């Protein structure tokens, strides 16, 4: 019903919540996968093979028979600790994300919250400036009945009668697209909400834009995470780096074998040469090995890696200009916002008195029932100008709290406080 | 020229007809190399090797060079199998989506050929709406050629007139670009296509809602899909358990081997040892291997391919509420068009008589001739959008048949059937 | 500030002249590392082996240290030469792209650049708009104080008002969106910028739109990368058919090993065999494969790159329609940009005219002040629709000839050209 316990209902009930929980947990899973393979390793095996020989070797025959158990463990790695560096990069980055995921999860269910009460509150204004279009269509029709008018005013509010229809069954059918945004984010249906009460609103200032430089070049995930993927490419650099090391191994295989003979040749002459034995066998390993010459694979991917680190830097130049963009294009979206509010007031007050100054206008005649629906209609404009405005200043409030990347579940629990009395979703 | 031949034209000359037919038979032909791995292989060897020693080994030389015949089978697979049926699963997904490349060809085609429609019919009374501005303006001009008006209706009407030309202009552009639907999509031109029996036309209910819940969670490919790529999860879940296996292996092969000798301490003492044989091989093998202790990405993909598996099960949710989303929205659509198109028929009425007391409240001079052209200009809105009504009421047609996934070529066909008498394409 | 000098301060400053330079740069260092696979191998090994003996074989010890010096060369190879050349279709694809980086940097910045000229100049006229309102609302308000008029059209006038003062405040947010566009893409502030010389602007008229089929067909770079694309895969036909290919092998090692000895069973009837003096080897090889039963797995890469040849020829007919489509849209664009202007300039003049004889209806008493607005009012969006169909004009210059891929940065020096005195963006 009202935000945050819709948000309960959102973060048991999102799919990207739970997908992208699905996301992070694969990737802290994939950091001990991917610490997996830093464990030595062990398996058996055995294998059976049958012998013949011909030219100028024809006549003797063997069959072979062997087991073996193996157990490896690495003297040199720094790639698993690379891919563990870039993978605890790669899970953190999933865990900004994530944190855009609660942050998005926040913004876009409250941001649709606030599109299924925008829907609501604007097809309220629709709804009762239907009803002034058929309270003075009515009393038209009525000065009619004794026939004051020509039938084309009674027959324009007719026709604008039916395009004020075609906004509450068209703006019906946003309410329930609005409640296929509950449904698709929620899941359900909520047959009232939580509304606004627009009584105590007021018009908080927003920060200082360069104390904003220093609140996003602080507090942004995204170039946060283009210095993820920056300091990423850099050990993609030391991870070609890692293509120039030498290397020590470590193995270990025991095994049995038997061999059992056969043939012409190998009966006669033998002299205990021939004789079953019993073999087994216990040995260790160790490898070393040096990188003389690759061919200069390497020195191009570190060049490469430079290339990802001064493009990755330009995603941060990228995400720079994206995110002032974000906290000063929401800036102003704040400062517009609020002023073209307070130009609503002052639209709403000069509508209603010049409403009822056309209504003193019709009385005497001076200006017909077209004036009134004008005044009338603008009015009803200018009430979805204020009151959807105080929706796009809630949208605003999630730009800047937002753009901070510090959108808690207390900035929307402060929201949730904004909030007032239900309203339904389905009347007639 | 009418729809399923031009849908014809799309279905030889779609490229991604073509192209995404050539996507689901590279899926066919990808089960086809996805079961070639499971097929013996035959190959050749042959080596040429020299030995040169020194210190221990400084007198005694030789050299070698065999050839081979291999040809293996392998004595355990779950994998391919999971290859395989990823690839069936996967390759049905491509067919899932391949009928959505017929559903969405039909889609884009059909409502790309309502677009071309709607370029036309909407410049069409763009053209007839220039004609009422002309007869108005031409007739007002001509009323002033005797001085009975100001100037300014006559330039007002200018402007206006302007207007529709540049409406005429763009919408003239929107029928260029109509051409782009038939040539971006058909590829060529058509002088003239089948309009739309307007004239006749019924308002369909549509099915009940949960019945489409029944019929959507029935006929859906989205989460069908979701469940394909689910279950592929279900085997990620155990192809982590396919790495869990054990195994057995076959192999085959057969050498030939020379050796010739030569050095100084070679020869000399040598007694038969060093004499030339030519020794010729045959080779079979088979090889287990056991999971004694693998590292811990043993079950790891297991957890991951549940993070896939509740990850397409919120795929299934996401899917779940974005099909219901679909066919509830397309429901909503359905309902405020029908309703809407009601409206628009009332616009008509009260508009067209309205207009006509309009002539009357103009011919007694109580309203100027902007009110006549406002009239005008609405009943062509009316006209425009009751005929865009029953045009987006075929979009609406569109999304519930095409909603359902039970969208055919007779579907097609039978909006093929609702089409009517050819209008130009380029007129002026 | 002029156009191209903010395109060099564009070109350092791209992030993605610079990531995508970087990629590109990347490509060309693919080539080097794509050619570094062909080039001879060298490199070290070393290693260790004790042996131990158990069950009919226990008492028998050894161990080697072997050192090797390994230096190969492939004696058959044609897939790192279509890696190397698809790593020139691919650095040559990323060549085009690059050329459609510099191409779609010059469009979009010289785009934004006209975006921020949009937002000054549609500003500015929102500016005197409002300065008409208030000067007939004061005015007006100045014949109320006399007692002439009523006070609706004061009010309405307040709601008109309110209106254009939320109009450039919105605007005033284009504008400081349109810095965070010069601040998105070139990064930075500018005081002011060039404005437009309108009064010397002439129409052009385009080239012949089959001529135009030449110059598309002749200079698209997203078809002529379908034929990249599309003989990269003919040679994926025939590089599946390079995996239907035998194959020869050249390699080249040497080294030593110690071979000292040991143990109980070792010890005892020796005979010269278990003296201690340490090994030297060399050693050579090669490797002649035949595609002898491979399973198949080749004809089904070779179908499916007959597939991605349908599939990049599918995207020449996609791309194929698509620049048709551009070429011919764009056409129309100019089309409908030019015959619109100058439906624009009669609305510049009839407006004019007409709102000189709403001045005399107004004067009289035949019209209220209303009519004032809306001759005013329309006469600014004649204003809008002007020069900003100037942007449109020049907009549709860089689309066909950005289009035709030729467009430089002489073209941008053309417009650049074609600018004028400049004008700042913050007045109040």
Redesign the interface.
């Given at each position: 019903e009202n935000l945050m316990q819709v948000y309960q209902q959102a973060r048991l009930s999102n799919?990207?919540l739970?997908?992208s929980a699905?996301?992070r947990?694969?990737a802290f899973?994939?950091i001990?996968?991917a610490?997996?393979?830093?464990?030595?390793?062990?398996?058996?095996?055995?294998?059976?093979?049958?012998?013949?020989?011909?030219?100028?070797?024809?006549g003797i025959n063997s069959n072979a028979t062997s087991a073996s158990?193996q157990?490896t463990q690495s003297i040199f790695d720094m790639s698993k600790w690379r891919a563990l560096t870039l993978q605890e990069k790669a899970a953190g980055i999933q865990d900004v994300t994530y944190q855009t995921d609660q942050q998005t999860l926040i913004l876009n269910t409250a941001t649709a919250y606030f599109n299924v009460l925008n829907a609501i509150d604007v097809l309220s204004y629709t709804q009762a400036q239907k009803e002034a279009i058929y309270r003075q269509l009515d009393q038209t029709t009525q000065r009619f009945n004794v026939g004051l008018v020509?039938?084309?005013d009674?027959?324009?509010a007719?026709?604008q009668?039916?395009?004020v229809?075609?906004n509450e069954?068209?703006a019906?059918?946003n309410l329930?697209?609005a409640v296929?945004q509950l449904?698709?984010?929620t899941?359900n249906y909520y047959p009232e909400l939580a509304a606004l009460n627009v009584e105590n609103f007021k018009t908080d200032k927003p920060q200082p834009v360069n104390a904003l430089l220093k609140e996003a070049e602080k507090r942004n995930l995204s170039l946060l995470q283009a210095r993820l993927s920056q300091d990423l490419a850099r050990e993609q650099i030391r991870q070609a780096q890692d293509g120039h090391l030498?290397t020590l191994?470590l193995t270990a295989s025991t095994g049995?074998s038997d061999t059992s003979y056969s043939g012409s040749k190998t009966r006669g002459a033998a002299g205990t040469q021939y004789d079953d034995?019993?073999?087994?066998?216990?040995?260790?390993?160790?490898?070393?090995?040096?990188?003389?010459?690759?061919?200069?694979?390497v020195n191009?991917?570190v060049?490469?890696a430079?290339?990802?680190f001064?493009?990755a830097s330009?995603?941060l130049?990228?995400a720079h200009?994206?995110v002032?963009?974000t906290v000063?294009?929401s800036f102003?979206?704040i400062?517009?916002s609020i002023?073209?509010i307070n130009?609503?007031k002052?639209?709403v007050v000069?509508?209603q008195?010049?409403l009822d100054?056309?209504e003193?206008?019709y009385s005497v005649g001076?200006?017909t029932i077209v004036?009134v629906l004008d005044?009338t209609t603008?009015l009803y404009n200018?009430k979805q100008?204020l009151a959807n405005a105080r929706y796009n200043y809630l949208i605003n409030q999630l730009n800047i709290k937002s753009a901070l990347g510090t959108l808690n579940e207390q900035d929307l629990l402060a929201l949730n406080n904004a909030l007032s009395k239900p309203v339904s979703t389905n009347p007639e």
């Open positions: 799919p990207e739970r997908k699905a996301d947990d694969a899973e994939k001990n996968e610490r997996s393979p830093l464990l030595p390793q062990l398996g058996l095996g055995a294998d059976y093979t049958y012998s013949n020989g011909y030219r100028d070797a024809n158990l157990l020509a039938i084309t009674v027959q324009n007719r026709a009668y039916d395009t229809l075609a069954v068209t019906r059918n329930d697209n296929e449904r698709q984010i899941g030498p191994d049995i034995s019993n073999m087994g066998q216990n040995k260790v390993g160790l490898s070393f090995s040096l990188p003389i010459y690759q061919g200069g694979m191009s991917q060049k490469q430079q290339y990802n001064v493009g330009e995603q130049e990228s200009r994206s002032v963009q000063r294009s102003n979206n400062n517009a002023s073209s130009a609503y002052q639209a000069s509508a008195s010049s100054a056309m003193a206008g001076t200006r004036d005044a603008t200018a100008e």
